[PDB]
Amino acid sequence: AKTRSSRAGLQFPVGRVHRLLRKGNYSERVGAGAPVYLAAVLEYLTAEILELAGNAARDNKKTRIIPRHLQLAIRNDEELNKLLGRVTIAQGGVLPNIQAVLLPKKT
Amino acid sequence: KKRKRSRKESYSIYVYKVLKQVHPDTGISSKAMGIMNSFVNDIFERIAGEASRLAHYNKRSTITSREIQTAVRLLLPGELAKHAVSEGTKAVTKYTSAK
Amino acid sequence: KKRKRSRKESYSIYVYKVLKQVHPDTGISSKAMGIMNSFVNDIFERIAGEASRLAHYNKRSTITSREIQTAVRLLLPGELAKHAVSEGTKAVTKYTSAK
Amino acid sequence: KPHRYRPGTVALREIRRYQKSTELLIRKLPFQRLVREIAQDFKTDLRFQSSAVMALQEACEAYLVGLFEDTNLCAIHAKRVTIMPKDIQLARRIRGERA
Amino acid sequence: KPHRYRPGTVALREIRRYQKSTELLIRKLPFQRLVREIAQDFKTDLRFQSSAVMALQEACEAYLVGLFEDTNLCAIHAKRVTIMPKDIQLARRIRGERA
Amino acid sequence: RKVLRDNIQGITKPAIRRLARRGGVKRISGLIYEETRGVLKVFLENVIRDAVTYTEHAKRKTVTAMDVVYALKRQGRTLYGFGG
Amino acid sequence: RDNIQGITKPAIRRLARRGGVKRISGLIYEETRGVLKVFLENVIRDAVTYTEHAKRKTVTAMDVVYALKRQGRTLYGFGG
DNA sequence: GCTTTTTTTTTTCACAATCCCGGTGCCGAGGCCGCTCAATTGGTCGTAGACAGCTCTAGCACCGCTTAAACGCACGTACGGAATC
Ligand SMILES: [Ca+2]
Ligand SMILES: [Ca+2]
Ligand SMILES: [Ca+2]
Ligand SMILES: [K+]
Numbered sequence: 001a002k003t004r005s006s007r008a009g010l011q012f013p014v015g016r017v018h019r020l021l022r023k024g025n026y027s028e029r030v031g032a033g034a035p036v037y038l039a040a041v042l043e044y045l046t047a048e049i050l051e052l053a054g055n056a057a058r059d060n061k062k063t064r065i066i067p068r069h070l071q072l073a074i075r076n077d078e079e080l081n082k083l084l085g086r087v088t089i090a091q092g093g094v095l096p097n098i099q100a101v102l103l104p105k106k107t
Numbered sequence: 108k109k110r111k112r113s114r115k116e117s118y119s120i121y122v123y124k125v126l127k128q129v130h131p132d133t134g135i136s137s138k139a140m141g142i143m144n145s146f147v148n149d150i151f152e153r154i155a156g157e158a159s160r161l162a163h164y165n166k167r168s169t170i171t172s173r174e175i176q177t178a179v180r181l182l183l184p185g186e187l188a189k190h191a192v193s194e195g196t197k198a199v200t201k202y203t204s205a206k
Numbered sequence: 207k208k209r210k211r212s213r214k215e216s217y218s219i220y221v222y223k224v225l226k227q228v229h230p231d232t233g234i235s236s237k238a239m240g241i242m243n244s245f246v247n248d249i250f251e252r253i254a255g256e257a258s259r260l261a262h263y264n265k266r267s268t269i270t271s272r273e274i275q276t277a278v279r280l281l282l283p284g285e286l287a288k289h290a291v292s293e294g295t296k297a298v299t300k301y302t303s304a305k
Numbered sequence: 306k307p308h309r310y311r312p313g314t315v316a317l318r319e320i321r322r323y324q325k326s327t328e329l330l331i332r333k334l335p336f337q338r339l340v341r342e343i344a345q346d347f348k349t350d351l352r353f354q355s356s357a358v359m360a361l362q363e364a365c366e367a368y369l370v371g372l373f374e375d376t377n378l379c380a381i382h383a384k385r386v387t388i389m390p391k392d393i394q395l396a397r398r399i400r401g402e403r404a
Numbered sequence: 405k406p407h408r409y410r411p412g413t414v415a416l417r418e419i420r421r422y423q424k425s426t427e428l429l430i431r432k433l434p435f436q437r438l439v440r441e442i443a444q445d446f447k448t449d450l451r452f453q454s455s456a457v458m459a460l461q462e463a464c465e466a467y468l469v470g471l472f473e474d475t476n477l478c479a480i481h482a483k484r485v486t487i488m489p490k491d492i493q494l495a496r497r498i499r500g501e502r503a
Numbered sequence: 504r505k506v507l508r509d510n511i512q513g514i515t516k517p518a519i520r521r522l523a524r525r526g527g528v529k530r531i532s533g534l535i536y537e538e539t540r541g542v543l544k545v546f547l548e549n550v551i552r553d554a555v556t557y558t559e560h561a562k563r564k565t566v567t568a569m570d571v572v573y574a575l576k577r578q579g580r581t582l583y584g585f586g587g
Numbered sequence: 588r589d590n591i592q593g594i595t596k597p598a599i600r601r602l603a604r605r606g607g608v609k610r611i612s613g614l615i616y617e618e619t620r621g622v623l624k625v626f627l628e629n630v631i632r633d634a635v636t637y638t639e640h641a642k643r644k645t646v647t648a649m650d651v652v653y654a655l656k657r658q659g660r661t662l663y664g665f666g667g
Numbered sequence: 668g669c670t671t672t673t674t675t676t677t678t679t680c681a682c683a684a685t686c687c688c689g690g691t692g693c694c695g696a697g698g699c700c701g702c703t704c705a706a707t708t709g710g711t712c713g714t715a716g717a718c719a720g721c722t723c724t725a726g727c728a729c730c731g732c733t734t735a736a737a738c739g740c741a742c743g744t745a746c747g748g749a750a751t752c
Contacts (some may be wrong), residue, residue, distance in 0.1 A: 094525060
């Protein structure tokens with residue numbers, strides 16, 4: 001008896017996902033590929049963010065990822081940003097950005 | 108001892124597992140993990156919803172991996188979409204042949 | 207012999223029926239009818255979805271007229287909400303009272 | 306004589322500080338009271354899970370912070386450095402918030 | 405008898421004229437060609453229902469008229485009567501159609 | 504228990520000035536501060552009304568963080584890091 | 588194929604009339620053109636994506652309408 | 668071309684804030700563990716929807732009219748934007 005995840009080469013719970021699908025009133029019937037595909041995409045997107053967040057944590061000389069790190073990862077990355085366009089990260093802050101005309105004259 | 112707290116599910120372990128695959132020596136705060144949990148739940152509902160509508164727009168009773176895919180193409184930006192479509196496809200192709 | 211158009215539903219007969227109530231002498235262009243039809247479908251799907259989330263959020267299997275109402279206070283602005291609820295209530299009260 | 310930074314030079318310091326940090330910038334209790342003050346107006350004798358008051362604050366500060374961003378762009382659009390209520394109203398008009 | 409309206413006076417007439425009417429303001433074929441041209445880049449040897457090109461035009465033009473409305477306000481916010489690229493970019497920056 | 508005070512004033516000038524700092528604002532009209540409060544007020548009304556409705560529908564007398572979250576997502580102002 | 592220029596100055600002016608616009612810089616007609624292009628790309632892509640998922644070669648009104656809705660620009664009067 | 672005044676740009680420090688380290692202490696990440704309930708296996712049964720076959724619809728191509736609309740130039744007015752206060 002083995003996990004559908006390990007059968008698909010994944011970390012995310014193929015089984016959990018399949019159940020959430022059935023139980024979420026998206027459709028009457030749910031193909032056996034669906035949760036395998038969906039779980040994998042969720043894993044890919046989680047991983048992408050965790051690479052970046054992680055880097056922005058290393059950058060801060062901090063061993064643990066915190067919301068700021070997530071925010072910096074996401075906001076600094078054209079695509080992640082779009083995807084999370086109307087999303088508000090709690091305790092994330094904003095990217096350092098002072099409009100040009102508000103600085104004094106540089107030399 | 109009194110009553111033990113009722114089960115609340117989470118993606119936390121699966122986020123951790125992933126985390127260690129990417130940045131082994133990197134860990135993660137309670138609040139951070141809560142954000143990851145929102146994010147996964149978010150994109151579930153997004154993709155599931157789009158797939159629901161795809162199926163229903165085509166008079167289909169079934170959300171198959173086809174629905175999940177087209178959905179992902181509709182919902183993800185370029186480079187993110189591709190890699191998604193790969194890793195999903197990979198992982199079905201593996202699942203299929205491991206029966 | 208030709209008999210091939212699909213059979214696609216519409217709310218047009220009821221748009222017309224309700225039309226003959228409010229203004230019995232005036233009619234309606236085809237394009238206007240189809241705006242109306244999109245209109246109903248829009249709001250159906252808006253109300254329903256919220257009511258579907260209300261349920262699912264409150265761990266229930268049943269969309270009831272309680273969910274329709276809650277959705278309606280959520281989805282319509284002040285005075286429309288009021289009359290919509292008011293008309294909703296009335297209609298249900300009258301239907302329990304008939305059979 | 307005594308030191309004295311030119312008008313703007315601390316303001317920029319403040320900007321750098323606050324963009325660099327994540328801490329909530331409204332005082333937590335006054336916010337709390339205000340929430341309850343507004344709560345009443347809909348339903349009397351209500352409780353709030355802290356986490357709910359905090360989720361409201363995170364959400365508020367965020368909204369306001371973005372509005373200032375859009376506002377500053379409206380000021381700068383009118384060849385100003387100084388944000389005004391007419392700047393805010395434009396942001397909000399264009400945003401779709403009010404008519 | 406050399407009669408000339410001063411600059412801006414027919415512009416106003418036009419504004420009045422076209423706000424009053426509903427007909428589409430882009431010539432149809434050129435539009436059609438543009439749709440088809442853009443279509444190719446996604447999937448070759450496509451066809452279109454005529455009604456799908458009309459839905460696309462109705463949408464585009466409506467998009468544009470609206471964007472202009474917001475652009476015009478952004479002009480006026482900078483004490484101008486004449487709309488300029490930068491006004492459109494602000495309109496879209498605030499709307500969130502781009503960074 | 505007790506009906507509440509006039510608190511909207513507790514959204515002080517300092518705080519409003521700090522928030523507009525986070526937003527990259529350098530110079531601030533005098534009139535900004537009261538205008539903000541009105542905006543802030545309308546925001547909280549709009550969210551809380553929706554939250555309280557989710558409360559009221561669940562027949563609970565205590566607004567939950569999820570009520571807020573569901574409302575906020577309804578308002579198009581999706582919030583991560585508090586559930587769902 | 589450079590049909591974008593089919594979106595003439597006149598047609599662009601007209602649209603902006605209806606937007607209550609009075610005077611128009613010369614640089615706008617191109618700026619408009621780009622914007623209009625980006626809009627169509629985003630709508631058409633999605634539309635065709637619906638087309639390819641129903642395994643058809645002919646884009647339908649519905650395809651458009653379903654895309655427009657995803658894009659938040661819901662459209663009444665073409666089979667909503 | 669001169670000549671003085673402002674005016675601009677550069678030089679010299681003095682100060683104040685910010686940054687960065689090591690040190691100290693606290694608490695929450697991290698992981699172990701034991702138990703539960705939710706995934707998995709291994710059955711059957713029904714129908715969703717893939718597939719082939721056909722109809723005929725509406726999409727496509729081309730032609731030639733008659734305009735209305737685009738275009739391209741001539742001319743100037745009112746508007747944008749710099750400068751000054
Ligand atoms: Ca790595
Ligand atoms: Ca059948
Ligand atoms: Ca002037
Ligand atoms: K056909």
